[PDB]
């Protein structure tokens, strides 16, 4: 009898953009610097005693 | 009998204003601002779990 929009059946609006959760980032890149080095296995020296 | 004032029957005197208790505004509607839409239900994107 009456026209309602249920006999539309309108598609939804799209809002652009994505909504997330934040994530933790790395703390060793922050707490310590990257030094430069050539692929492969580094080796470092050590003092294990003084005189 | 002496002539009291309750024979007279008087009006009352009607005082000029409305006394109210206040209502809360909305909260919604200072925390969140609102956004433009047209008319009809929208959709948003969601980032359900990140990799």
Redesign the interface.
Known sequence: AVLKTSSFQ?P????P?????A?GQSVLARLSNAEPQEFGEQQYMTLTAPP
Chains 1, 2 share one sequence.
């Open positions: 309108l939804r609006h799209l809002v953009g994505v909504w997330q959760k994530q």
